[PDB]
């Protein structure tokens, strides 16, 4: 049986300097995802992500999640997941992505990645 | 910066009977991916894969890799990565995908997934 390569996930280069804060808006728009569990992860080689911060399950509006220098927030009203990394270190450089936990029997809607490049002043 | 969950990743619902052998062909086709490391993974919720079998890095042609009932083979000459799961069992049911280890700056190409469904005799 044949499995095609009919998909590509880009890496939107996002550059900032050390000390500065990362601000990303992950517009899932479809309220059909509001209650869905979402997370922010750093992508390791082989498409193996490591979860840095996730929302509760279900995900209730206006309940920011703080994990270290990470702030995750699910705004249902505008249907978007807002992610933030304060006081970026150069070591933070890497591939990141927002993720919406969705069931196996349904096609998955995927966010493109963020190639974070943190530089020195 | 704001992104959208703009790409679909579908699960090819595939049915097989216990005891059969799942034979899958993953067409990366481009010579550019011939020596890249590759793997067979089962996906868990949150887009978190569990690597069941991977090639060497680099991947050498016709160097069969076997782990358990899983047999992986990279056919450079065909631009295909072949995967086999011998004597299938009900527990083998799940969401699977071939993966090509790709560098961070390049858009990552992704193979269609397969929702394996193994049922009783
Ligand atoms: N984030 C993980 C990945 C497992 C997962 O999603 N874990 C936390 C997320 S920060 C959670 O309670 N999620 C449960 C669920 O969705 O299974 C860990 O570092 O333990």
């Amino acid at each position: 049986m044949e499995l095609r390569a009919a998909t590509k996930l880009t890496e939107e280069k996002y550059e900032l300097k050390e000390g500065q804060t990362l601000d990303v808006k992950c517009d899932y728009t479809l309220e059909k995802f509001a209650s869905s569990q979402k997370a922010w992860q750093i992508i390791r080689d082989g498409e193996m992500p490591k979860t840095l911060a996730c929302t509760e399950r279900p995900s209730k509006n206006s309940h920011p999640v703080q994990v270290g220098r990470i702030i995750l927030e699910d705004y249902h009203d505008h249907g978007l997941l807002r992610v933030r990394m304060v006081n970026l270190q150069v070591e933070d450089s890497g591939l990141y992505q927002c993720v919406i936990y969705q069931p196996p029997k349904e096609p998955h809607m995927l966010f493109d990645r963020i190639r974070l490049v943190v530089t020195l002043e």
Side-chain angles (χ1 to χ4, degrees), chain A residues 1-10 12-121:
Chain A
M1 178 197 76
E2 142 218 297
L3 282 181
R4 294 162 179 165
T7 282
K8 287 182 178 169
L9 278 185
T10 59
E12 274 40 289
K13 176 193 182 70
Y14 183 80
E15 195 172 309
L16 295 180
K17 296 200 171 179
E18 209 165 63
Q20 202 150 323
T21 287
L22 161 293
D23 188 67
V24 177
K25 297 181 177 180
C26 280
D27 178 13
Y28 57 99
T29 184
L30 294 190
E31 49 180 293
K32 300 189 174 184
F33 289 124
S35 59
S36 297
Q37 181 176 23
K38 311 175 177 59
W40 175 244
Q41 10 186 243
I42 190 173
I43 299 293
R44 289 296 146 61
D45 204 41
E47 306 309 68
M48 264 153 79
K50 166 178 176 178
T51 300
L52 299 176
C54 74
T55 73
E56 288 191 299
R57 182 188 198 299
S59 183
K60 47 189 174 183
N61 199 313
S62 53
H63 278 81
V65 179
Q66 292 180 290
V67 186
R69 309 185 273 100
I70 294 175
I71 302 183
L72 188 60
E73 171 164 45
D74 193 356
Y75 295 121
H76 299 333
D77 57 304
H78 293 110
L80 98 171
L81 186 67
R82 197 169 167 195
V83 188
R84 300 189 78 171
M85 284 195 263
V86 296
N87 196 40
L88 291 173
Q89 264 63 67
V90 75
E91 290 74 6
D92 290 321
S93 298
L95 240 195
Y96 297 87
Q97 77 171 3
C98 286
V99 186
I100 295 171
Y101 285 59
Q102 32 210 302
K105 300 178 185 176
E106 227 76 62
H108 291 195
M109 292 305 98
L110 302 172
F111 280 105
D112 287 300
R113 281 63 178 280
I114 288 171
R115 185 158 65 73
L116 174 62
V117 176
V118 184
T119 74
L120 280 184
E121 290 272 45

